[PDB]
């Protein structure tokens with residue numbers, strides 16, 4: 001899937017975690033976000049098409065996805081400890097990363 | 107590759123980075139550390155061989171490499187900006203992530 005499908009998947013599962021009528025939907029949703037984030041990390045966004053992969057901007061943009069994937073993997077840890085609210089609160093924390101990247105690169 | 111070979115790679119290039127002399131050297135050493143860190147992240151560590159790949163311990167273990175990769179990518183931003191002393195400093199702080207995962211999972 002291209003970059004915007006991944007972003008759509010990230011968007012839809014974030015909402016899933018917020019309304020989780022459970023405790024293992026969190027895990028399920030987080031797994032899909034992990035998959036989407038990782039896959040979106042290999043894509044060059046529109047506003048950096050003409051730039052070098054070695055360019056600081058490309059590493060900065062890739063760093064955002066490292067941080068995001070780290071935040072999800074940590075929430076997957078909390079959710080797999082059965083800590084439903086902390087994992088859901090860790091998922092709220094993710095929007096920092098979404099918005100920091102959108103502000104500079106979308 | 108096996109986890110032990112990726113760890114030797116991380117150890118050797120961290121040492122190359124500290125012996126310095128140019129941001130181009132740091133950049134190449136960091137490129138190899140990144141490739142090894144991503145592969146190590148796929149391994150199963152001996153101390154966790156008989157626990158679920160979805161256990162919190164395995165998620166904390168994969169989290170460790172998320173943090174490392176993200177730190178490496180930050181240090182590649184600096185090396186590619188030509189800031190060798192800043193990039194070295196950022197590469198020396200990888201040892202915190204090393205030590206921390208070793209304290210738990212080695």
Ligand code: HEC
Pocket residue numbers: 003004005007008010011014045046061062063064065068094095097098099101102105106
């Ligand atoms: C960079 C490191 C990003 C992170 C982290 C996140 N997103 Fe993103 N997003 C990014 C780009 C470059 C773009 C635009 C790409 C393009 O092709 O123009 C987007 C776009 C979106 C969208 C719009 C979807 C669409 O138009 O089809 C959404 C809904 C979206 N992003 C959501 C989203 C969420 C919820 C994130 C964190 C949980 C997130 N993104 C992270 C770059 C980056």
Ligand code: HEC
Pocket residue numbers: 109110111113114116117118120151152166167168169170171174200201203204205207208211212
């Ligand atoms: C977990 C998230 C780790 C991170 C991050 C780092 N290391 Fe590691 N290391 C880890 C394990 C589980 C092991 C045991 C390997 C095994 O197969 O049992 C290791 C081992 C090492 C070793 C010595 C073992 C060998 O290579 O034969 C070294 C020298 C080593 N690790 C170095 C190293 C460095 C320099 C790291 C970052 C700067 C680092 N490791 C990160 C787990 C994890």
